[PDB]
Paper text:
The TMEM106B folds shared a similar five-layered ordered core comprising residues S120–G254 and contained 17 β-strands, each ranging between 3 and 15 residues. We observed three TMEM106B folds, with no clear relationships between folds and diseases.
We also determined the structures of filaments comprising two protofilaments of fold I, related by C2 symmetry. In all three folds, residues G177–N183 adopt a conserved conformation, with the positively charged residues K178 and R180 pointing outwards. Individuals with fold I were homozygous for T185 or S185, or heterozygous, indicating that fold I can accommodate a threonine or a serine at position 185. Filaments with fold I were more common than filaments with folds II or III.
Numbering used by the authors:
A (entry chain B), B (entry chain C), C (entry chain A): 120 to 254
Amino acid sequence: SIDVKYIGVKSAYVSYDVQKRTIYLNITNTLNITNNNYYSVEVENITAQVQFSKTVIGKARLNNITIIGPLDMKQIDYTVPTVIAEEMSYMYDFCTLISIKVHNIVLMMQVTVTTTYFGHSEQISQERYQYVDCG
Amino acid sequence: SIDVKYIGVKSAYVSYDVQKRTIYLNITNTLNITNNNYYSVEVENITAQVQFSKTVIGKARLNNITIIGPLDMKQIDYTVPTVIAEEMSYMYDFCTLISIKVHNIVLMMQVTVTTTYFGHSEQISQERYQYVDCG
Amino acid sequence: SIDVKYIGVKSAYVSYDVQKRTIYLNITNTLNITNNNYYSVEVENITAQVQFSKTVIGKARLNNITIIGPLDMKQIDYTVPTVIAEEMSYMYDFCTLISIKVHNIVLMMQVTVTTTYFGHSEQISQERYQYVDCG
């Protein structure tokens, strides 16, 4: 990939930005741009390509075979009891979080037992992230 | 990929923006642009392509064979009991959250037992994310 | 990859930006730009390519065979009990967080038992991240 950008506030090719309480006076601005972009990208020129898979089983004897793909999750436990007991008392809770297995982004690609792949594969994340703000 | 951008506030090719309480006077702005973009992208030129899969089973004996794909989840347990007991007391809760297995974006592509693939695959995420904000 | 940039605030090719309480007077700005970009990227020129897979089982005897892919999670336990006991007392909680297995970005590509791959694979992450902010 090409030209992958995170810009926090402002993007220009040419900028003349005049901001705050300023005097901007008698200004002559002249601009003469030639800006051409030529892309030959992710391009393929092939006579033959072959993706061949063969399984042969002859006079074989097969017992108790297990094939298990990735991210097998077995007998996982989360135990998060919360207890408040009060007498003659005050609780003030502000912005209190209990957070279990919270996800923002999950991107999964070609997650398999078996893969035969030819060509291009791509993942991009661009992000402003804030979990907690309070005040 | 090409030209993948995250811009926080403003994007322009040429910008003459004037913001606040400013004086802009007698200004002469002149602009002459040539800006051409030429794209030959993800182009394919192929004479032959073959995706062959063959399974042959002769006088074989097969018993107890298990093929399990990815992300298999078994007997997972979440226990999150919340208990509040109060007498002659005061509870003030503001912005209190209990969050279990919360997802924003889940993208899954080519998640399989077996795969034969030729070409292009792509995942893009662009995001402004705030989980909690309070005051 | 090419031209992957993280810019915290402002991006320009040319900038004439005027900020705060300034006097900008009689300025003559003249600009002549020639800026052409030529990209021949991720380009392929091949006569033959072969992805061949063959499995042959003869007069063989197979028993108790287990094949397990990556990220296998078994009997994981999270125990996070929170207990507050109060009598004749005051509790003030501000911005209190309990966070268990919280994920932002999860990018997974080609996670497999077996893989045959030809070509390009790419992962890009650009991020402004704040977990907690409070006052």
